[PDB]
Structures are given as structure tokens and as C-alpha cells.
Amino acid sequence: EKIIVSACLLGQPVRYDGQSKGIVSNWLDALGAEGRALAFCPEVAGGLPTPRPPAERQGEHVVTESGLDVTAEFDRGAELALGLCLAQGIRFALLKEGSPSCGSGRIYNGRFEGVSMAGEGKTTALLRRHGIQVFSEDQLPELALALSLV
Ligand code: SF4
């Protein structure tokens, strides 16, 4: 049984600033070694470049600080994540917290002022709407238990 993982959590330099959010986790390493962790970046899959300017949700819209609307790419990446899960039989996701794409518990408020609020990213919202459970890097034991049970 596989999971879809935010590519940045696996150390891939696909973050908006070309950096990575590689996490230290023996369990995630073992899952990867078994070919069960499918790296995925909604923003890069949606057609956005690396690097790219920061973006925040404003309701259903996703915009940059300058007002550029990038919802089309966010929604494409969200739909490609779902497509990958349906094709591979994946029903769990390990996505990056705070992201306008991958956030599951929190996101930035859309005012470009460093203020976080409770909410979810566009990919997470789509995945959960289709019955796929989304966990963050702060919920690895919960995700591991859910995956061990099936
Ligand atoms: S879109 Fe998601 S997977 Fe891609 S770099 Fe941003 S947080 Fe990581």
C-alpha cells in the first residue's frame, strides 16, 4: 500500500525558494526504500517554476503578493495529485503543513503579513473531498498507524 508525499518532505528542491523541507524520519526512509512513497509537488506539476514567488489563498483563489492569480496551476496540480492516487490505489497523503497547496491544519491568511490561520491547501482540500486522508509532517505516528492498519 503506497502514499503520496509532498516532494519537498523527501528533500527535493521544489520549494518556492529552491530549498527543501527534507524531514528526518527512519519510517519515511524505509517506506521510500520499499517504493511506497510517491514524491509529488502540486505546484511544479501544475506548471509553476522553481523558484516562484510566494502565494496565499484568498478563498478559492491563490494569488501572489503582486496580485498575479495562480489558481489555474494550483487546481491543475491538485487534480493531478488526485489522478495519481486514483491510478495507484492510494488513500493516504503526507503533505507539507502551512502550504497553500499541501497545508492540512494551517495556511497563511491571504493578507501577506506572516499570519497563519486554521485551514487547508487546495491539494489537501481536493484529496480529502475524495476520501483520501491527509496527514502533515507533525502527524507521522498517526499516518504510520493508519497505513499499518490497512
Ligand atoms: S507545493 Fe507542496 S510539495 Fe511542492 S514544494 Fe510546495 S509544499 Fe512542497
How would you describe what is shown here?
The chain is of the alpha/beta class and 150 residues long. The protein has one domain. Helices cover 32% and strands 19% of the residues. The chain has five helices and eight strands, in the order βαβαββαβββαβα. It has helices at residues 26-33, 42-45, 71-88, 122-129, 140-149, and strands spanning 3-6, 37-40, 55-58, 61-64, 92-94, 106-108, 116-118, 133-135. It has a four-stranded parallel beta sheet, sandwiched between helices. β3 and β4 form a beta hairpin. α3 runs parallel beside α4 (122-129). It is globular and about 45 Å long. The termini are close together. Residues 6-8, 14-15, 41-43, 96, 99, 101-102 line the site of iron/sulfur cluster (SF4).
What would you say about this model in short?
With 150 residues, this protein is an alpha/beta fold. Helices cover 32% and strands 19% of the residues. It has one domain.
What structural class should be given to the helix and strand makeup?
A: alpha/beta
Work out the helicity level: 25-40%
**Fraction of residues in β-strands:** 15-25%
Q: How many domains comprise the coordinates?
A: 1
Major beta sheet summary: 4 strands, parallel
Strand order in space, largest sheet: 2-1-5-8
Shape: globular
Cα radius of gyration in angstroms: 14 Å
How many angstroms does the end-to-end distance come to?
8 Å
Ligands bound, unique: iron/sulfur cluster
How many helices in DSSP terms? 5
Number of strands: 8
Order of helices and strands: EHEHEEHEEEHEH
